[PDB]
Design a protein around this ligand. Structure first.
Ligand SMILES: CCCCCCCCCCCCCCCCCC(=O)OC[C@H](COP(=O)([O-])OC[C@H](O)COP(=O)([O-])OC[C@H](COC(=O)CCCCCCCCCCCCCCCCC)OC(=O)CCCCCCCCCCCCCCCCC)OC(=O)CCCCCCCCCCCCCCCCC
Ligand SMILES: CCCCCCCCCCCCCCCCCC(=O)OC[C@H](COP(=O)([O-])OCC[N+](C)(C)C)OC(=O)CCCCCCCCCCCCCCCCC
Ligand SMILES: CCCCCCCCCCCCCCCCCC(=O)OC[C@H](COP(=O)([O-])OCC[N+](C)(C)C)OC(=O)CCCCCCCCCCCCCCCCC
Ligand SMILES: CCCCCCCCCCCCCCCCCC(=O)OC[C@H](COP(=O)([O-])OCC[N+](C)(C)C)OC(=O)CCCCCCCCCCCCCCCCC
Ligand SMILES: CCCCCCCCCCCCCCCCCC(=O)OC[C@H](COP(=O)(O)OCCN)OC(=O)CCCCCCCCCCCCCCCCC
Ligand SMILES: CCCCCCCCCCCCCCCCCC(=O)OC[C@H](COP(=O)(O)OCCN)OC(=O)CCCCCCCCCCCCCCCCC
Lengths: 177, 87, 171, 558, 128, 459, 100
């Protein structure tokens, strides 16, 4: 459907995701824990009844009317985790997630308030800038003709090098600033 | 409020959940025990284990990551990634 | 203060304090504390300021405009006289506006001061307000934003034609 | 006299002094939230003296102290109306706000913008006491738009979150649709009565007052979340908990109800306005209480609770009983602020968990929170001789015994039962039973800020109805003669609601899985009203704002 | 059996209940792989400029520039006056103007006729 | 008025004889001194206007537009000095000279005793504005706007010229003071109908009118910041000033010739406000907001009640300040991200908190938050149009919803949400930029204390 | 190929060479004195003394006089029994209507 690595969903992935969404919407339907745990083993039995189905077209049809079953029996407001998308605390602290380059725009009177921090940030940036051209020339010889096929990136191969396209993943803001 | 998570704490809690699971014996369970190949579980059981992690720690692991967590060490490393432990 | 005729205030009737219960109210103690802590220092500072007012007594005056000829006895297209008529008419327009504002202040203060018996006890102020609003409407309504003494005279002449025709059709 | 007006203005100037303090800052603060809480405590103490010397004599006045403008017949002066409504609302609002800020010094402690939060909350309090003390329509419009804009700024507090900005713009939209009617009322009174002052409106006493009262009813619809313009009050739970506690339960959302209570000599001589208020209030108190039966977010459930109580306030205005409605405002503030504070204490204890389906077992874990939540729910439902009994039951004792729309009365009683239903639903899923929250218990409430802040509103929710209703003078005649099946109406309907919802709650322990009914899908998706109109009315605007407005006409043809 | 979900303009069909999502054919593999390839190439072309330290500024997005140029500039030079454009520019162009014209003219003629017949309550109406 | 024209002209030897690093400081200082001098025009009277000479006069309509004009020059010199830093010194002095010449034209456009001197100065203001927009506009793509300027010259200023020469032959004068006392009623005839269109359509395009607003979201976009400031703040208000002068002669035919154009504005503010909900370009959004606010001034002049003129001149002053501040905020982001796309740079309250406070205040004045003079003008126009027709409140109030809707959307898009990742040149706020925002906003907030000086000649 | 063209100049940062830059100029002494000129002749001169000037305007458009004059005239015609305002602005005796 829409994924970074694969261009599709395998049938095994579709079965597992439908099982998970069915259990989550079921737990939304079935608030109490022993009651949900009873119906959860019942639903696990219903999913393991046709676990050993060899015919992929028949399993496709069974998965399709299982999606119809799940859509007919879904909860209108299922339990979303608070920091899950659709939750009450979701993306709440994104107004506190200042990007790191703004530290470069500080005045030197407040840069001198934290001397060890910026004295270490200088060699962090030094590390980034002497890693950049090596990881660019790493990516230019491994990428096939026509660009990269999948969005996944190779790791650091040599010893001493850093993995390519790493600075915004490493220096990302904390989830609770 | 909001107590700090540690890799000792995340490790001990993930293993504490998996030792309360009736298809994993508490004597063969290690920190690198693979779910399908070493503990002999199903992908259905693996989805139930990742949903038990979601029940344990109070957040959600998406399915593109839930389809690949195949040891307790990957679970501890993923929660370390999504919680920023050992500051 | 001000003039008690243009701003009339009927004689105040307060009841006497009639303490029936033995529990002492907080309001007398707070009134004495306000009289000591607040009224006295403010009053002393005001007396100092008023002594300094007395150390230089100087006066200002209310400007008077003697009545110039109005728009009726000014010639047509003679701007030297009808300018004077227009300035007189505009000063009278703003003064009539402030007369209406004085009658509104009377009506609002009567309504609050009478409280719940405002409908019974403010019939005279409501009557004066109806008369002054009828007068101001007959004199200055519907002129437009480019109002002048000529517009007001033409409205007065149309109203006088209507009143004369209404007098004629009654006989 | 010189005490009353002086301390009246001292209260408002004292509330404005920390705004000058936070704007004239150079240092980092020696606990500016404690400074604002101390200031609002002392402003409460200051406003207590004019209230006591109003209860002594009935002393009302007007302070038209500063002449501001004169548009040819309209002298707009800075004019403060100290009547019964201000003398009962200002101490209640300052007391509730003082408890909300001692709550916020605990709840909002992790926020690095805590000084901006207390600044915005004080700005809201200033605009609200501008609203409830204004003597002309213009100063009331100042306070009206002020509480609308501080509602915007306090819904969108976590401004990075898309849903908070969406809910804030939604609330601004519905409030400006109410402002259409408010400006309609100002336009009618200026043209037909030559005034925005209340005194000249009341003294002239017009008879063809259907159109300004329709404008005021549309204004109260936009402001008090009545039906048609309601869903922003459930959407506005995306802001922080003391925001929803102070503003959107007890203080801001009563301002449309306060606008209609303020204009009672026009409504008491217009039966059509009374009938429209009765129908709209009964529709809202039915609909929001029905939507509250099948929700799972606790802030949503208590927001539907406060909107159903606002609909009941609109009902008891619509039976020409405005002073009972205002007594219900002053009563409702205490226990509804306390219910939001206890719900947020549960939320902060359970690590930002708001969904009631992951709560439970909190009777002995959070004992003080459980005690105060039960007391707030019982004051909401109409337990005998709590504070909510001293107004709401009397509302029913005048809703039965009056020349009333019969279906409005029947929907009022269905709402009275539904209040008991969602109250014991909150107590069932959140306090009773066995736990459902995750495994790392960080449950704690032992801060004197939280405990004292819930404690003072607890003293309010126990004693304040008795104290106020024995300190207010009669302004109507209380209808006290009725048959015994009619006197026992509200209590029996409330207990029937408790019994029906306890049977519903004990059908959930059964090991059965039923398919969802159409009533459940209707009430859970909010009467389908925020699902359709929030999609359709923007769509039909914005395509029309692009295809024909921008592209076709104003880039090609014209 | 079950109620089938009805899609709408503002209620789209889900990904799960669409049948063409369950295509297994190799031409769908080719289309999905080419979409993944274009998306991966554009992702790489973005985050080589994004993660560059020597760049300090705005990674300009020509799709965004192209979108704004379509929403502003391309409106007139691809216009052709035909039946559809003229009728839709006459419906929403001079329609509601005529509507509010006759509504306000009707109400003002009514109010003027009531004022010159002494009917309209213009008693305390001295601000205007 | 000659104590204002001569210092404005002495700003030319002040700007050409100044040292190369001193030409912004000197012109800003002496234009602020002229703006302090500009308060002597507040010697107004309740009956008589302030009549200086045969050539110049000032009632309470022209006086606040004069104070706003003389105040706008230092703000334009502050706003336009950053993006002219790499400019040639002589070209920089040419820019400052065109700004000074535009102020010189405006301050004797508003005081013009006679109407053809008003016409000469009125059409004289277009030339330095034209040169500022097309020599410093940073891109010029005007393939459709040439034909529209031809339409402005054909349907606008030239029939006004022929009509004013006709009044000069008929009345014998075009002194507005003489025309106060020698005005004849303009009756119903076809000659008087074309007379009304000739007297009004130039000022209709200058406001602008809906349907005739096609120039304004182009000329605001293709301009420098000083050009957009003077277009939003003053150059639209020449149309309203000229309408309030020329509608003296157009009675009583206005009482039935206003009915089309009133519709064009009453529906028009419903459309352009809605157009602001679908703007990709922030500067175009502020342009369509300017159209949506000047529609009310068109209606308030055409219904010619006292409350409508008071609200219209208060709305003109307030919208001048507010929309000038909005264009300056749009430039304070454009000088960083180098694109006017409103969805490009988001979440800016995370990065610039004081500048987001200025965005919040300019949005609240844009959506007419009371007691600001935006709301006072808006409100008095709404009261007067309710006296015109009781249904129009709907078209007022619906506008007053949508005017709120795009005002906060402009706040929510640019300042709230998640910040854009690939933009890292977002510098902190320069003290120049914050000073520019404060010199817009603090006069606009102080005028709420004493609004009687911006309510026109019939307050 | 296309013509001989100078490349696009990069946007300079005024904080690099001068971290105390107010943004008025790149020369720091010129920048600070531009700041002092803008702040003194803008805020200390025009806003403060301008608000002081406007606040003490000598009865802007004679409103206060017109109230006090009204406080004369009402007092003149409450006492003499006259109505407070006539319905005719001018004397109806000095007006000649068109006959019919
Ligand atoms: C003639 C003498 C007069 C003396 C009295 C003064 C009269 C008014 C003057 C101007 C008032 C505003 C000044 C501050 C705002 C602009 C600067 C700013 O943003 O500063 C933030 C900053 C504080 O924030 P920060 O944390 O330090 O940094 C910014 C944050 O990063 C990020 O910021 P943030 O988001 O955290 O906080 C921003 C916050 C955001 O808050 C809001 O947006 C809420 C505002 C709207 C709702 C509440 C108000 C509703 C209306 C009711 C109140 C008005 C009527 C009251 C009367 C009684 C009832 C009728 O704004 C405020 O707190 C501003 C408070 C005042 C707001 C006024 C209304 C603005 C709304 C739009 C117009 C409304 C109608 C017109 C009102 C006119 C009033 C006269 O303030 C300062 O540093 C102060 C600087 C110095 C201010 C001087 C003021 C006077 C200037 C005039 C000079 C000439 C006369 C001499 C007098 C000198 C007196 C000292
Ligand atoms: C710490 C701060 C306090 C100051 C400490 C230092 C001074 C010590 C205290 C003493 C002060 C001096 C003596 C008292 C003050 C002077 C009294 C006096 O007569 O002043 C003249 C006047 C009184 O008005 P007036 O009636 O005399 O004249 C009005 C002017 N005309 C007639 C031309 C229209 O002004 C004041 O008092 C000004 C203060 C007003 C206070 C409220 C301001 C609110 C501003 C809101 C703006 C928007 C309004 C919108 C709403 C409008 C209504 C709907
Ligand atoms: C704007 C759209 C209309 C512009 C019309 C052109 C400018 C007219 C200026 C006013 C002239 C005038 O006095 O008109 C009355 C005069 C009346 O003639 P007169 O004033 O010489 O006649 C003596 C007086 N009466 C009428 C009593 C007999 O109108 C004309 O002579 C013609 C007016 C229309 C002009 C037609 C050509 C231009 C068409 C539109 C182009 C745009
Ligand atoms: C004007 C047209 C051009 C527009 C642009 C202009 C740009 C150039 C600017 C030039 C300088 C400024 C000119 C306009 C000045 C306007 C201000 C002015 O003069 O006001 C006069 C007004 C005059 O008031 P007044 O009308 O009562 O004056 C009475 C007259 N005298 C003084 C002679 C007795 O000044 C004041 O009101 C000052 C009163 C004291 C200060 C204010 C106290 C209260 C303030 C609020 C307190 C907190 C409230 C709660 C807040 C809550 C949070 C929001
Ligand atoms: C107020 C007076 C409350 C007491 C009088 C009403 C008693 C009553 O009818 O209670 C009904 C019911 C108890 O009966 P039930 O729950 O069916 O049986 C199990 C018993 N523990 O349920 C209850 O007692 C619970 C609801 C009580 C409501 C109290 C607030 C009103
Ligand atoms: C396009 C750009 C965007 C929009 C901007 C505005 C452009 C158009 C500007 C003009 C607007 C329409 C014209 C004004 C209408 C005023 C009322 C009117 O003329 O009514 C139509 C008229 C009714 O007849 P009546 O008015 O009695 O004529 C005798 C007059 N003594 O009916 C008739 O007499 C019949 C028709 C005769 C032709 C009239 C042509 C002249 C008017 C248009 C120029």
């Amino acid at each position: 459907a829409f994924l970074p690595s694969a261009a599709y969903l395998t049938h095994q992935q579709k079965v597992l995701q439908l099982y998970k969404r069915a259990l989550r919407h079921l737990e939304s339907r079935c608030v109490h824990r022993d009651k949900y745990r009873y119906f959860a083993c019942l639903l696990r039995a219903r999913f393991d009844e046709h676990k050993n189905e060899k015919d992929m077209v028949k399993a496709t049809q069974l998965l399709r009317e299982a999606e119809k079953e799940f859509w007919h029996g879904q909860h209108p407001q299922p339990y979303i985790f608070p920091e899950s998308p659709g939750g009450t605390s979701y993306e709440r602290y994104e107004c506190y997630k200042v990007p790191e380059w703004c530290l470069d725009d500080w005045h030197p009177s407040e840069k001198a308030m934290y001397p060890d921090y910026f004295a270490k940030r200088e060699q962090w940036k030094k590390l980034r800038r002497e890693s950049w051209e090596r990881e660019v020339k790493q990516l230019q010889e491994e990428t096939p003709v026509g660009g990269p096929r999948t969005e996944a990136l190779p790791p650091a191969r040599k010893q001493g090098d850093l993995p390519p396209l790493w600075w915004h993943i490493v220096t990302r803001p904390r989830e609770r600033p | 409020d909001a107590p700090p998570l540690t890799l000792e704490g995340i490790k001990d809690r993930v293993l504490y959940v998996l030792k309360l699971y009736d298809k994993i014996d508490p004597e063969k369970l290690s920190v690198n025990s693979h779910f399908m190949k070493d503990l002999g579980l199903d992908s259905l059981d693996q989805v139930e284990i990742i949903m038990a992690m979601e029940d344990e720690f109070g957040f959600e692991i998406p399915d593109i990551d839930a389809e690949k967590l195949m040891c307790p060490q990957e679970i501890v490393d993923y929660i370390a990634d999504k919680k920023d432990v050992y500051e | 203060s001000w003039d008690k005729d243009v701003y009339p205030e009927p004689p105040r009737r307060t009841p006497a304090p009639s303490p029936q219960t033995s529990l002492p109210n907080p309001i007398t103690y707070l009134t004495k504390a306000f009289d000591l802590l607040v009224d006295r220092p403010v009053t002393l500072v005001r007396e100092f300021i008023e002594r300094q007012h007395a150390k230089n007594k100087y006066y200002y005056y209310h400007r008077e405009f003697r009545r110039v000829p109005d728009i009726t006895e000014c010639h047509e297209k003679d701007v030297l006289c009808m300018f004077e008529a227009e300035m007189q008419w505009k000063r009278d327009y703003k003064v009539d506006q402030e007369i209406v504002n004085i009658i509104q202040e009377r009506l609002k203060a009567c309504q609050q001061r009478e409280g719940e018996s405002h409908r019974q006890n403010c019939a005279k102020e409501l009557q004066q307000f109806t008369q002054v609003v009828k007068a101001y409407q007959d004199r200055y309504h519907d002129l437009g934003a480019h109002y002048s003494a000529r517009k007001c005279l033409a409205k007065q002449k149309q109203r006088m034609l209507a009143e004369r025709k209404a007098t004629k059709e009654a006989a | 006299m010189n005490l009353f007006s002086s301390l009246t203005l001292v209260t408002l100037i004292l509330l404005t002094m920390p705004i000058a303090a936070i704007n004239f800052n150079t240092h980092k603060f020696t606990n500016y939230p404690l400074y604002v809480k101390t200031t609002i405590s002392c402003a409460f103490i200051t406003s207590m003296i004019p209230t006591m010397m109003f209860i002594h004599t009935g002393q009302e006045m007007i302070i038209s102290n500063w002449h501001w403008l004169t548009i040819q017949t309209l002298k707009l002066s800075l004019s403060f109306k100290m009547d019964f409504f201000s003398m009962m609302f200002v101490p209640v609002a300052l007391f509730v706000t003082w408890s909300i800020m001692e709550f916020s010094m605990w709840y909002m402690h992790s926020d690095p913008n805590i000084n901006q939060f207390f600044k915005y909350l004080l700005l809201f309090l200033i605009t609200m006491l501008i609203l409830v003390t204004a003597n002309n329509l213009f100063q009331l419009f100042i306070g009206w738009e002020g509480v609308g804009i501080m509602s915007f700024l306090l819904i969108g507090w976590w401004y990075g979150r898309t849903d908070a900005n969406t809910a804030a713009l939604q609330a601004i939209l519905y409030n400006r649709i109410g402002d259409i009617g408010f400006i309609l009322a100002m336009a009618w009174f200026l043209i037909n009565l030559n005034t925005w002052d209340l005194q000249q409106i009341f003294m002239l006493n017009p008879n063809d007052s259907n159109l300004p009262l329709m404008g005021l009813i549309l204004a109260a619809t936009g402001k008090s979340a009545q039906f048609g313009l309601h869903p922003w009050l459930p959407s506005a739970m995306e802001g922080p908990t003391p925001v929803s506690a102070l503003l959107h339960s007890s203080t801001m959302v009563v301002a449309g109800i306060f606008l209609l209570i303020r204009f009672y000599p026009l409504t008491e001589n217009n039966k059509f306005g009374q009938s429209i208020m009765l129908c709209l209030g009964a529709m809202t108190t039915l609909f929001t209480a029905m939507c509250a039966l099948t929700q799972n977010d606790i802030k949503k459930i208590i927001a539907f609770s406060t909107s159903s109580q606002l609909g009941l306030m609109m009902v008891t205005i619509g039976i020409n009983q405005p002073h009972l409605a205002f007594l219900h405002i002053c009563t409702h503030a205490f226990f509804k602020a306390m219910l939001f504070m206890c719900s947020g204490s549960i939320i902060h204890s359970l690590n930002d968990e708001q969904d009631i389906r992951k709560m439970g077992g909190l009777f002995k874990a959070m004992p003080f929170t459980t005690t105060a939540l039960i007391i707030g729910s019982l004051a909401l439902t109409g337990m005998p001789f709590l504070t909510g009994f001293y107004s709401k039951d009397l509302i029913i004792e005048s809703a039965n015994t009056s020349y009333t729309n019969a279906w409005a009365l029947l929907m009022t009683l269905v709402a009275t039962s539904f209040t008991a239903i969602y109250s014991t639903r909150i107590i069932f899923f959140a306090l009773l039973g066995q736990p459902r929250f995750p495994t790392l218990i960080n449950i704690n409430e032992n801060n004197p800020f939280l405990i004292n802040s819930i404690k003072r509103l607890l003293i309010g929710s126990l004693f304040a109805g008795f104290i106020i209703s024995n300190n207010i003078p009669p302004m109507t005649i209380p209808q006290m003669t009725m048959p015994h099946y009619l006197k026992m109406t509200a209590l029996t309907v409330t207990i029937l609601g408790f019994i029906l919802a306890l049977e519903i709650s004990n059908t959930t322990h059964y090991l059965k899985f039923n398919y969802p009914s159409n009533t459940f899908k209707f009430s859970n998706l909010l009467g389908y009203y925020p699902t359709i109109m929030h999609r359709l009315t923007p769509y039909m605007n914005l395509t029309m704002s692009q295809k024909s407005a921008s592209s076709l006409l104003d880039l090609i043809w014209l | 059996s079950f109620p089938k979900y009805e899609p709408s303009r503002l209620a789209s069909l889900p990904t799960t209940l669409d049948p063409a999502e369950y295509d297994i054919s190799s031409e769908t593999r080719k289309a999905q792989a080419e979409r993944l390839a274009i998306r991966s190439r554009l992702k790489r072309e973005y985050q080589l400029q994004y993660n560059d330290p020597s760049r300090r500024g705005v990674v300009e997005d020509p799709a965004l520039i192209r979108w704004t140029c379509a929403r502003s500039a391309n409106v007139y030079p691809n216009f052709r006056p035909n039946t559809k454009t003229s009728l839709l520019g006459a419906l929403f162009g001079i329609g509601p103007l005529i509507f509010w014209y006759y509504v306000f003219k009707t109400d003002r003629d009514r109010k003027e006729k009531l004022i010159q017949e002494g009917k309209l309550d213009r008693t305390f109406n001295i601000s205007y | 008025m000659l104590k204002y024209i001569i210092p404005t002209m002495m700003l030319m030897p002040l700007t050409w004889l100044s040292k190369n690093s001193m030409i912004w400081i000197n012109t800003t200082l002496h234009s602020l001194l002229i703006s302090l001098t500009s308060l002597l025009l507040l010697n107004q009277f309740g009956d008589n206007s302030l009549n200086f000479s045969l050539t110049f006069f000032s009632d309470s309509l022209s006086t606040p537009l004069l104070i706003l004009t003389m105040w706008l020059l230092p703000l334009m010199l502050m706003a336009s000095q950053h993006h002219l830093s790499k400019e040639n010194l002589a070209r920089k002095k040419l820019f400052i000279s065109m700004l000074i010449l535009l102020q010189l034209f405006l301050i004797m456009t508003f005081t013009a005793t006679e109407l053809i001197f008003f016409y000469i100065m009125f059409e004289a203001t277009l030339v330095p504005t034209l040169i500022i927009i097309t020599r410093w506009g940073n891109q010029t793509e005007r393939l459709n706007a040439g034909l529209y300027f031809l339409f402005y010259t054909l349907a606008g200023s030239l029939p006004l010229l022929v009509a004013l020469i006709y009044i000069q032959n008929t009345m014998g004068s075009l002194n507005f003071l003489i025309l106060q006392y020698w005005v004849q009623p303009m009756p119903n005839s076809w000659s008087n109908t074309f007379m009304w269109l000739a007297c009004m359509m130039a000022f209709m395009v200058k406001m602008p009118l809906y349907g005739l607003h096609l120039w304004l979201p182009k000329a605001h976009v293709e301009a420098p910041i000083a050009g957009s400031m003077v277009l939003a703040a003053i150059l639209l208000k020449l149309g309203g000033y000229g309408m309030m002068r020329i509608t003296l002669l157009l009675n009583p035919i206005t009482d039935f010739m206003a009915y089309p154009f009133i519709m064009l504005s009453l529906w028009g503010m419903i459309m352009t406000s809605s157009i602001c909900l679908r703007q990709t370009d922030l500067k175009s959004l502020i342009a369509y907001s300017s159209v949506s606010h000047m529609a009310l001034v068109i209606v308030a002049i055409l219904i010619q009640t006292p409350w409508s003129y008071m609200g219209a001149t208060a709305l003109m002053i307030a919208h001048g300040l507010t929309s000038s501040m909005l264009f300056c905020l749009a430039n304070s982001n454009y000088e960083r991200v180098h694109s006017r796309t409103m969805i490009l740079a988001r979440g800016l309250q995370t990065l610039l908190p004081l500048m987001a406070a200025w965005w919040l205040l300019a949005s609240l004045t844009n959506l007419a938050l009371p007691p600001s003079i935006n709301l006072i003008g808006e409100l008095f126009v709404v009261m007067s149009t309710f006296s015109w027709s009781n249904i129009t409140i709907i078209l007022m109030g619906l506008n007053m919803v949508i005017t709120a809707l795009y005002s906060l959307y402009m706040l929510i898009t640019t300042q709230r949400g998640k910040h854009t990742h690939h933009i890292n040149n977002i510098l902190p706020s320069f003290t120049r930029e914050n000073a520019l925002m404060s010199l817009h906003m603090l006069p606009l907030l102080l005028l709420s204390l004493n609004p009687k000086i911006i309510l026109g000649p019939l307050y | 190929l296309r013509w001989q063209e100078d490349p696009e100049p990069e946007d300079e940062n005024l904080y690099e060479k001068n971290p105390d830059s107010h943004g008025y100029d790149k020369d720091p002494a010129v920048d600070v004195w531009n700041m002092r000129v803008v702040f003194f002749f803008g805020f200390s001169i025009v806003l403060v003394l301008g608000s002081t000037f406007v606040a003490y305007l000598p009865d802007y458009r004679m409103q206060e006089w017109a109230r006090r004059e009204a406080e004369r005239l009402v007092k003149y015609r409450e006492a003499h029994g006259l109505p407070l305002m006539e319905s005719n602005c001018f004397d109806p005796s000095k007006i000649q209507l068109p006959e019919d």
